Amino acid sequence: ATKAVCVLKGDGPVQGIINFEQKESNGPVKVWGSIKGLTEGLHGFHVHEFGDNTAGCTSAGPHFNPRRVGDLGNVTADKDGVADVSIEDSVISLSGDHCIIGRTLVVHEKADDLGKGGNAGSRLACGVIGIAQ
Amino acid sequence: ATKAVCVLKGDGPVQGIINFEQKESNGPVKVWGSIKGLTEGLHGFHVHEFGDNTAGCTSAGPHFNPRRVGDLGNVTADKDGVADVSIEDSVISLSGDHCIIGRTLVVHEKADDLGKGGNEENAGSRLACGVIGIAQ
Ligand SMILES: [Zn+2]
Ligand SMILES: [Zn+2]
């Protein structure tokens, strides 16, 4: 398993395809793609524990955390509502204990302040992360 | 005990939830749930290789086979178009080489004749599918 993909969907217009690639076991995972239908600005971007969409994104459960492992920061939507995603992350994995295959990728309503807010709302869209060609 | 779950959806009315449970890594996998929106009768029931929903059920690629590993026989819909599923399989797994987590469960248009259709000389289109996810 060196490649994965996730199709994000929700009750609103938020949708996108997010690719994952990890060329070396235990190596960094590159995450890239595009999300549209977002409000301009920052949106929390997280892997949640369960790849369970039985009740929409709510059944994905909590932030994945065997920074939390699943915490992928924010994505940034432009004035057109489009977020172009290009991240490299050394904590998530496509195998082993930190493997995110079969878990859920979520884009949030609000910005994640990363715990540095000086003193991220609903789940707009999600999908199960699957093995890709 | 590993647990997995799959929500099936597709281009038409076919929808369902299928659960997986495997008590030990070398034990059988119980598969159970229900699918609705089906024509009465048999429908091929397969794990396909890729958990890729970029193109409906088509991007799932081929039948999973590292009978084929992904071949889970057929499911049987009743007169209400509902197939109640309860299967035990000792070839698929929720870990290791035959792991189906991150792959795609597919329910087909037609029966899979299981290679016993009587003409050595077929499941048809994919009605619904879902990526198989880790469950609580
Ligand atoms: Zn989150
Ligand atoms: Zn098939």
User: Six-digit token pair at B70?
Assistant: 């992904």
**Which resolution in angstroms does this entry have?**
1.9
* Angstrom distance (rounded) from CA A124 to CA A13: 9
Q: Do B52 and A130 touch (CB under 8 A)?
A: yes
Q: Is B104 part of the contact surface with chain A (CB cutoff 8 Å)?
A: yes
How was this entry determined? Answer: X-ray
Asked whether the beta carbons of B52 and B28 are under 8 A apart, the reply is: no
Task: Name the residue in chain A with its Cα closest to that of B130.
Answer: A128
Q: Is B133 part of the contact surface with chain A (CB cutoff 8 Å)?
A: yes
Domains of chain A: 1-133 (2.60.40.200)
* Angstrom distance (rounded) from CA A58 to CA A37: 20
Contacts of A52 in chain B (CB under 8 A): 5, 133-136
Q: Is the dihedral of CA B57, A129, B73, B135 positive or negative?
A: negative
Nearest to A97 by CA among B134, B5, B23: B134
What is the full DSSP assignment across chain B? -EEEEEEEB-SSS-EEEEEEEESSTTS-EEEEEEEESPPSEEEEEEEES----TTTTGGG-SB-----TTEEEEEEE-TTS-EEEEEEESS-BSSSTTB-TTSEEEEESS---TT-SS------SEEEEEE-EE--
